Protein backbone atom coordinates (compact mmCIF):
# COMPACT_ATOMS: atom_id res chain seq x y z
CA UNK A 1 0.00 0.00 0.00
CA UNK A 2 2.80 2.43 1.02
CA UNK A 3 6.56 2.63 0.30
CA UNK A 4 9.33 2.11 2.85
CA UNK A 5 12.84 3.47 2.07
CA UNK A 6 15.66 1.86 4.10
CA UNK A 7 17.58 4.05 6.56
CA UNK A 8 20.66 3.51 8.74
CA UNK A 9 20.81 5.52 12.03
CA UNK A 10 18.87 7.51 14.66
CA UNK A 11 18.32 9.47 17.13
CA UNK A 12 14.72 10.87 16.51
CA UNK A 13 11.84 8.33 16.74
CA UNK A 14 9.43 10.98 15.32
CA UNK A 15 10.31 13.52 12.48
CA UNK A 16 7.02 13.08 10.46
CA UNK A 17 8.08 15.99 8.14
CA UNK A 18 6.88 17.05 4.61
CA UNK A 19 8.80 16.98 1.26
CA UNK A 20 9.11 20.49 -0.26
CA UNK A 21 11.54 19.86 -3.16
CA UNK A 22 14.30 17.69 -4.73
CA UNK A 23 17.89 18.01 -6.10
CA UNK A 24 18.42 16.60 -9.64
CA UNK A 25 21.58 16.27 -11.83
CA UNK A 26 21.70 14.46 -15.26
CA UNK A 27 24.80 12.66 -16.66
CA UNK A 28 26.38 11.88 -20.07
CA UNK A 29 25.19 9.24 -22.53
CA UNK A 30 22.13 10.72 -24.33
CA UNK A 31 21.68 7.89 -26.98
CA UNK A 32 18.19 9.10 -28.20
CA UNK A 33 16.29 10.24 -25.05
CA UNK A 34 17.45 12.00 -21.82
CA UNK A 35 17.75 10.19 -18.44
CA UNK A 36 17.92 11.99 -15.04
CA UNK A 37 19.07 11.03 -11.49
CA UNK A 38 19.06 12.68 -8.00
CA UNK A 39 22.22 14.23 -6.44
CA UNK A 40 21.40 17.54 -0.76
CA UNK A 41 19.23 15.03 -2.83
CA UNK A 42 15.90 16.25 -1.29
CA UNK A 43 14.63 19.43 0.48
CA UNK A 44 12.48 19.48 3.66
CA UNK A 45 10.57 22.27 5.54
CA UNK A 46 11.22 25.06 2.98
CA UNK A 47 8.82 27.05 0.75
CA UNK A 48 6.28 25.24 -1.50
CA UNK A 49 4.94 26.59 -4.86
CA UNK A 50 1.48 28.26 -5.31
CA UNK A 51 -0.21 26.16 -8.08
CA UNK A 52 1.62 23.12 -9.61
CA UNK A 53 5.38 22.20 -9.52
CA UNK A 54 7.69 25.15 -10.40
CA UNK A 55 10.95 23.97 -12.10
CA UNK A 56 14.03 26.09 -13.02
CA UNK A 57 17.79 25.45 -13.60
CA UNK A 58 21.19 27.29 -13.66
CA UNK A 59 21.93 25.98 -17.23
CA UNK A 60 19.25 23.77 -18.92
CA UNK A 61 21.64 22.97 -21.84
CA UNK A 62 24.55 22.01 -19.51
CA UNK A 63 24.42 18.50 -17.97
CA UNK A 64 26.98 19.35 -15.18
CA UNK A 65 24.63 21.95 -13.55
CA UNK A 66 22.03 21.32 -10.79
CA UNK A 67 18.28 21.45 -11.61
CA UNK A 68 15.79 22.99 -9.12
CA UNK A 69 12.41 21.33 -8.39
CA UNK A 70 9.96 23.29 -6.19
CA UNK A 71 6.78 21.21 -5.57
CA UNK A 72 3.29 22.60 -4.85
CA UNK A 73 1.92 19.68 -2.77
CA UNK A 74 3.65 18.64 0.50
CA UNK A 75 4.60 14.90 0.39
CA UNK A 76 4.36 13.34 3.91
CA UNK A 77 7.56 11.57 5.17
CA UNK A 78 7.15 9.55 8.46
CA UNK A 79 10.58 8.35 9.87
CA UNK A 80 11.35 5.99 12.86
CA UNK A 81 13.93 3.69 14.58
CA UNK A 82 13.54 1.18 17.55
CA UNK A 83 12.45 3.44 20.44
CA UNK A 84 12.22 1.34 23.74
CA UNK A 85 15.13 2.47 26.02
CA UNK A 86 13.51 1.75 29.49
CA UNK A 87 15.85 -1.23 30.16
CA UNK A 88 19.57 -0.30 30.37
CA UNK A 89 21.60 -0.48 28.24
CA UNK A 90 20.45 -2.74 25.35
CA UNK A 91 17.15 -2.05 23.52
CA UNK A 92 14.11 -4.34 24.03
CA UNK A 93 11.15 -5.30 21.76
CA UNK A 94 10.88 -4.68 17.98
CA UNK A 95 14.23 -4.19 16.24
CA UNK A 96 12.70 -3.89 12.65
CA UNK A 97 15.23 -1.41 11.09
CA UNK A 98 15.52 2.36 10.53
CA UNK A 99 13.00 3.34 7.84
CA UNK A 100 11.10 6.25 6.30
CA UNK A 101 7.48 5.86 5.07
CA UNK A 102 5.70 7.49 2.00
CA UNK A 103 2.36 6.54 0.26
CA UNK A 104 2.78 4.64 -3.11
CA UNK A 105 0.27 6.75 -5.12
CA UNK A 106 1.05 10.05 -3.29
CA UNK A 107 4.68 10.14 -4.57
CA UNK A 108 3.69 8.81 -8.07
CA UNK A 109 1.02 11.57 -8.41
CA UNK A 110 3.70 14.16 -7.39
CA UNK A 111 6.26 12.56 -9.77
CA UNK A 112 3.86 12.84 -12.78
CA UNK A 113 3.56 16.62 -12.07
CA UNK A 114 7.39 16.89 -12.46
CA UNK A 115 7.23 14.62 -15.59
CA UNK A 116 4.66 16.83 -17.43
CA UNK A 117 6.65 19.99 -16.52
CA UNK A 118 9.87 18.20 -17.71
CA UNK A 119 8.28 17.67 -21.19
CA UNK A 120 7.65 21.43 -21.93
CA UNK A 121 11.24 22.47 -20.91
CA UNK A 122 12.64 20.13 -23.65
CA UNK A 123 9.94 20.68 -26.35
CA UNK A 124 7.62 17.74 -25.45
CA UNK A 125 8.41 14.19 -26.86
CA UNK A 126 8.57 13.01 -23.21
CA UNK A 127 10.39 9.75 -22.27
CA UNK A 128 11.48 10.69 -18.69
CA UNK A 129 13.82 8.08 -17.11
CA UNK A 130 14.58 7.94 -13.34
CA UNK A 131 17.80 6.04 -12.51
CA UNK A 132 20.27 5.78 -9.55
CA UNK A 133 22.88 8.48 -8.69
CA UNK A 134 26.36 8.67 -10.31
CA UNK A 135 28.28 8.93 -6.99
CA UNK A 136 31.16 11.13 -5.83
CA UNK A 137 30.51 11.24 -2.05
CA UNK A 138 28.56 8.80 0.28
CA UNK A 139 26.24 11.82 0.96
CA UNK A 140 25.23 11.91 -2.80
CA UNK A 141 24.28 8.17 -3.21
CA UNK A 142 22.52 8.13 0.25
CA UNK A 143 20.16 11.14 0.93
CA UNK A 144 22.02 13.33 3.42
CA UNK A 145 19.74 15.95 5.07
CA UNK A 146 18.52 17.48 8.36
CA UNK A 147 15.44 16.52 10.40
CA UNK A 148 15.02 17.18 14.12
CA UNK A 149 18.28 19.16 14.30
CA UNK A 150 20.58 16.22 13.39
CA UNK A 151 22.05 15.27 9.97
CA UNK A 152 21.59 11.65 8.70
CA UNK A 153 21.97 9.74 5.37
CA UNK A 154 19.96 6.75 4.01
CA UNK A 155 19.32 5.06 0.60
CA UNK A 156 16.28 5.71 -1.60
CA UNK A 157 16.42 3.92 -5.06
CA UNK A 158 12.85 2.53 -4.47
CA UNK A 159 11.71 6.18 -4.87
CA UNK A 160 13.34 6.71 -8.35
CA UNK A 161 12.81 3.40 -10.22
CA UNK A 162 10.17 4.44 -12.83
CA UNK A 163 10.02 5.59 -16.50
CA UNK A 164 7.33 8.08 -17.60
CA UNK A 165 6.00 8.57 -21.19
Amino acid at each position, epitope marked *: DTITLPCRPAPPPHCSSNITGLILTRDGGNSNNESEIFRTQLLLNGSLAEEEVVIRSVNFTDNAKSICVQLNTSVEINCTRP*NNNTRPGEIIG*DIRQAHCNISRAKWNNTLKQIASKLREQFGNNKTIIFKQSSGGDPEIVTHSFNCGGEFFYCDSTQLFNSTWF
Partner: antibody
Amino acid sequence: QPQLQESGPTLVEASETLSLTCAVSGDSTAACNSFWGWVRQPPGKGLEWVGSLSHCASYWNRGWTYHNPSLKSRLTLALDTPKNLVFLKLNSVTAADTATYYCARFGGEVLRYTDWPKPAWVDLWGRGTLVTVSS
Amino acid sequence: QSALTQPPSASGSPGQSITISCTGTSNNFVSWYQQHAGKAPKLVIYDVNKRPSGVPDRFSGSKSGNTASLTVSGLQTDDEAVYYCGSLVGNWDVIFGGGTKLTVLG
Protein backbone atom coordinates in the same frame (compact mmCIF):
# COMPACT_ATOMS: atom_id res chain seq x y z
CA GLN B 1 12.50 -20.48 43.61
CA PRO B 2 10.15 -19.83 40.62
CA GLN B 3 6.83 -21.69 41.25
CA LEU B 4 3.46 -21.59 39.44
CA GLN B 5 0.38 -22.41 41.64
CA GLU B 6 -2.98 -23.50 39.99
CA SER B 7 -6.33 -23.02 41.85
CA GLY B 8 -10.06 -23.38 41.22
CA PRO B 9 -13.04 -25.77 41.11
CA THR B 10 -11.83 -29.40 40.64
CA LEU B 11 -15.41 -30.38 39.54
CA VAL B 12 -17.18 -27.98 37.13
CA GLU B 13 -20.71 -28.88 35.80
CA ALA B 14 -21.58 -29.30 32.06
CA SER B 15 -22.29 -26.18 29.87
CA GLU B 16 -21.01 -23.86 32.68
CA THR B 17 -17.89 -21.53 32.63
CA LEU B 18 -14.65 -23.18 33.79
CA SER B 19 -12.38 -20.82 35.81
CA LEU B 20 -8.76 -21.28 37.02
CA THR B 21 -6.12 -18.89 38.54
CA CYS B 22 -2.32 -19.13 38.68
CA ALA B 23 -0.22 -17.67 41.51
CA VAL B 24 3.27 -16.80 40.18
CA SER B 25 6.17 -16.81 42.79
CA GLY B 26 9.86 -16.33 41.95
CA ASP B 27 9.34 -14.19 38.80
CA SER B 28 7.47 -10.97 37.89
CA THR B 29 4.60 -11.10 35.41
CA ALA B 30 5.58 -7.48 34.54
CA ALA B 31 8.99 -8.71 33.11
CA CYS B 32 9.55 -8.31 29.30
CA ASN B 33 11.51 -11.58 28.74
CA SER B 34 8.52 -14.05 28.72
CA PHE B 35 4.77 -14.75 28.06
CA TRP B 36 2.43 -16.36 30.54
CA GLY B 37 -0.37 -18.85 29.85
CA TRP B 38 -1.77 -22.40 29.95
CA VAL B 39 -1.36 -25.94 28.50
CA ARG B 40 -4.09 -28.65 29.05
CA GLN B 41 -3.77 -32.49 28.90
CA PRO B 42 -6.86 -34.82 28.67
CA PRO B 43 -6.89 -38.01 30.86
CA GLY B 44 -4.21 -40.09 29.16
CA LYS B 45 -3.88 -37.85 26.07
CA GLY B 46 -1.26 -35.44 24.56
CA LEU B 47 -0.19 -31.94 25.67
CA GLU B 48 -2.43 -29.25 24.20
CA TRP B 49 -1.47 -25.57 24.02
CA VAL B 50 -4.21 -23.32 25.39
CA GLY B 51 -2.84 -19.78 24.95
CA SER B 52 -0.58 -16.97 26.31
CA LEU B 53 -0.16 -13.18 26.87
CA SER B 54 2.26 -10.35 28.11
CA HIS B 55 1.48 -6.62 28.82
CA CYS B 56 4.94 -5.59 27.40
CA ALA B 57 3.80 -3.56 24.34
CA SER B 58 5.10 -1.72 21.24
CA TYR B 59 4.12 1.64 19.58
CA TRP B 60 1.00 0.00 17.99
CA ASN B 61 -0.46 -2.08 20.88
CA ARG B 62 -1.10 -2.22 24.68
CA GLY B 63 0.27 -5.82 24.97
CA TRP B 64 -0.07 -9.20 23.14
CA THR B 65 -2.61 -12.08 23.43
CA TYR B 66 -2.27 -15.42 21.50
CA HIS B 67 -4.98 -18.18 21.39
CA ASN B 68 -5.33 -21.79 20.17
CA PRO B 69 -7.73 -21.23 17.17
CA SER B 70 -10.28 -23.93 18.27
CA LEU B 71 -10.39 -22.86 21.94
CA LYS B 72 -10.49 -19.08 20.93
CA SER B 73 -14.29 -18.90 20.82
CA ARG B 74 -14.64 -20.13 24.45
CA LEU B 75 -11.68 -18.53 26.20
CA THR B 76 -10.35 -15.35 27.95
CA LEU B 77 -6.69 -14.97 29.07
CA ALA B 78 -5.77 -12.51 31.86
CA LEU B 79 -2.75 -11.00 33.70
CA ASP B 80 -2.66 -9.25 37.14
CA THR B 81 0.80 -7.65 36.80
CA PRO B 82 0.96 -6.39 40.50
CA LYS B 83 -1.05 -9.19 42.25
CA ASN B 84 1.20 -11.62 40.19
CA LEU B 85 -1.78 -13.67 38.96
CA VAL B 86 -2.65 -15.37 35.59
CA PHE B 87 -6.26 -16.19 34.68
CA LEU B 88 -8.21 -18.60 32.46
CA LYS B 89 -11.91 -18.45 31.66
CA LEU B 90 -13.38 -21.25 29.51
CA ASN B 91 -17.15 -20.92 28.86
CA SER B 92 -19.72 -23.60 27.78
CA VAL B 93 -17.73 -26.72 28.82
CA THR B 94 -18.21 -30.34 27.68
CA ALA B 95 -16.77 -33.62 29.07
CA ALA B 96 -14.32 -33.11 26.11
CA ASP B 97 -12.80 -30.26 28.22
CA THR B 98 -11.95 -32.63 31.16
CA ALA B 99 -8.11 -32.28 31.50
CA THR B 100 -5.23 -31.61 33.92
CA TYR B 101 -4.80 -27.88 33.32
CA TYR B 102 -1.12 -26.69 33.69
CA CYS B 103 0.05 -23.12 34.33
CA ALA B 104 2.84 -22.46 31.79
CA ARG B 105 5.68 -19.93 31.59
CA PHE B 106 6.49 -19.34 27.91
CA GLY B 107 10.01 -18.63 26.65
CA GLY B 108 11.24 -18.30 23.06
CA GLU B 109 11.95 -15.30 20.80
CA VAL B 110 10.12 -12.95 23.25
CA LEU B 111 12.19 -10.02 24.83
CA ARG B 112 13.82 -8.42 21.70
CA TYR B 113 11.76 -9.52 18.59
CA THR B 114 11.19 -8.44 14.96
CA ASP B 115 7.59 -7.52 13.87
CA TRP B 116 6.03 -9.53 16.77
CA PRO B 117 7.21 -11.75 19.72
CA LYS B 118 7.58 -15.51 18.99
CA PRO B 119 7.15 -17.45 22.35
CA ALA B 120 7.89 -21.16 21.58
CA TRP B 121 8.60 -23.24 24.75
CA VAL B 122 7.12 -23.88 28.21
CA ASP B 123 10.30 -23.23 30.27
CA LEU B 124 8.71 -23.28 33.78
CA TRP B 125 5.68 -25.53 34.60
CA GLY B 126 3.16 -25.94 37.48
CA ARG B 127 1.98 -29.14 39.30
CA GLY B 128 -1.37 -29.01 37.47
CA THR B 129 -4.97 -29.73 38.58
CA LEU B 130 -7.70 -32.03 37.27
CA VAL B 131 -11.03 -30.46 36.31
CA THR B 132 -13.91 -32.92 35.78
CA VAL B 133 -16.85 -31.73 33.53
CA SER B 134 -20.22 -33.53 34.18
CA SER B 135 -23.88 -33.66 32.95
CA GLN C 1 -5.99 -31.95 14.74
CA SER C 2 -2.52 -30.70 13.75
CA ALA C 3 0.26 -32.56 15.67
CA LEU C 4 3.97 -33.41 15.37
CA THR C 5 4.79 -36.96 14.24
CA GLN C 6 6.43 -38.78 17.18
CA PRO C 7 6.53 -42.66 17.37
CA PRO C 8 4.02 -44.03 19.94
CA SER C 9 6.44 -46.02 22.09
CA ALA C 10 10.18 -46.87 22.39
CA SER C 11 12.45 -49.13 24.49
CA GLY C 12 16.09 -49.71 25.59
CA SER C 13 17.95 -51.52 28.45
CA PRO C 14 20.13 -49.75 31.15
CA GLY C 15 23.36 -48.44 29.61
CA GLN C 16 22.00 -48.39 26.04
CA SER C 17 21.18 -45.19 24.05
CA ILE C 18 17.78 -44.35 22.54
CA THR C 19 17.10 -41.86 19.72
CA ILE C 20 13.47 -40.74 19.25
CA SER C 21 12.16 -38.69 16.22
CA CYS C 22 9.76 -35.68 15.64
CA THR C 23 8.47 -34.48 12.14
CA GLY C 24 6.57 -31.30 11.12
CA THR C 25 9.03 -28.61 12.43
CA SER C 26 10.22 -26.36 9.55
CA ASN C 27 11.82 -23.76 11.93
CA ASN C 28 14.37 -24.09 14.80
CA PHE C 29 11.95 -23.24 17.69
CA VAL C 30 12.12 -26.98 18.59
CA SER C 31 11.67 -28.22 22.19
CA TRP C 32 11.60 -31.61 24.04
CA TYR C 33 9.75 -32.45 27.29
CA GLN C 34 10.01 -35.19 29.94
CA GLN C 35 6.87 -36.59 31.60
CA HIS C 36 6.92 -38.82 34.63
CA ALA C 37 3.75 -40.90 35.04
CA GLY C 38 1.82 -39.36 37.93
CA LYS C 39 3.67 -36.01 37.43
CA ALA C 40 3.88 -32.72 35.40
CA PRO C 41 6.20 -32.23 32.29
CA LYS C 42 9.82 -30.90 32.63
CA LEU C 43 11.65 -29.25 29.67
CA VAL C 44 14.88 -31.18 28.72
CA ILE C 45 15.73 -29.22 25.49
CA TYR C 46 14.96 -25.94 23.57
CA ASP C 47 16.46 -24.11 20.43
CA VAL C 48 17.13 -27.56 18.90
CA ASN C 49 20.44 -28.25 20.76
CA LYS C 50 20.26 -26.31 24.09
CA ARG C 51 19.77 -27.91 27.57
CA PRO C 52 18.27 -25.96 30.50
CA SER C 53 19.71 -25.76 34.08
CA GLY C 54 20.80 -28.93 35.88
CA VAL C 55 19.83 -31.17 32.96
CA PRO C 56 22.53 -33.83 32.11
CA ASP C 57 24.68 -33.67 28.93
CA ARG C 58 23.37 -37.16 27.99
CA PHE C 59 20.16 -35.48 26.71
CA SER C 60 20.89 -34.07 23.18
CA GLY C 61 19.23 -32.05 20.37
CA SER C 62 19.42 -32.58 16.61
CA LYS C 63 17.41 -31.30 13.56
CA SER C 64 17.98 -32.51 9.97
CA GLY C 65 15.65 -31.14 7.34
CA ASN C 66 12.10 -31.27 8.77
CA THR C 67 13.00 -33.84 11.47
CA ALA C 68 14.07 -33.08 15.05
CA SER C 69 15.65 -35.76 17.24
CA LEU C 70 16.35 -36.31 20.91
CA THR C 71 19.03 -38.80 22.04
CA VAL C 72 19.10 -40.30 25.60
CA SER C 73 22.51 -41.95 25.96
CA GLY C 74 23.22 -44.28 28.90
CA LEU C 75 19.66 -45.09 29.98
CA GLN C 76 18.69 -45.55 33.66
CA THR C 77 15.59 -46.30 35.81
CA ASP C 78 14.67 -42.54 36.08
CA ASP C 79 14.58 -42.23 32.26
CA GLU C 80 11.30 -44.23 31.89
CA ALA C 81 8.93 -41.37 31.05
CA VAL C 82 6.84 -39.97 28.14
CA TYR C 83 8.80 -37.66 25.83
CA TYR C 84 6.98 -34.93 23.89
CA CYS C 85 8.42 -32.63 21.18
CA GLY C 86 7.12 -29.07 20.45
CA SER C 87 7.60 -26.21 17.91
CA LEU C 88 6.37 -22.70 16.96
CA VAL C 89 4.04 -22.50 13.92
CA GLY C 90 2.76 -19.97 11.39
CA ASN C 91 2.88 -16.69 13.26
CA TRP C 92 2.81 -17.32 17.00
CA ASP C 93 0.90 -20.60 17.51
CA VAL C 94 2.56 -23.58 19.29
CA ILE C 95 2.32 -27.41 18.59
CA PHE C 96 3.27 -30.54 20.49
CA GLY C 97 3.93 -34.08 19.21
CA GLY C 98 1.93 -37.15 20.22
CA GLY C 99 4.69 -38.07 22.66
CA THR C 100 6.87 -41.23 22.59
CA LYS C 101 6.45 -43.60 25.56
CA LEU C 102 9.94 -44.67 26.80
CA THR C 103 10.50 -48.02 28.63
CA VAL C 104 13.61 -49.03 30.58
CA LEU C 105 13.90 -52.85 30.33
CA GLY C 106 15.13 -55.23 33.02
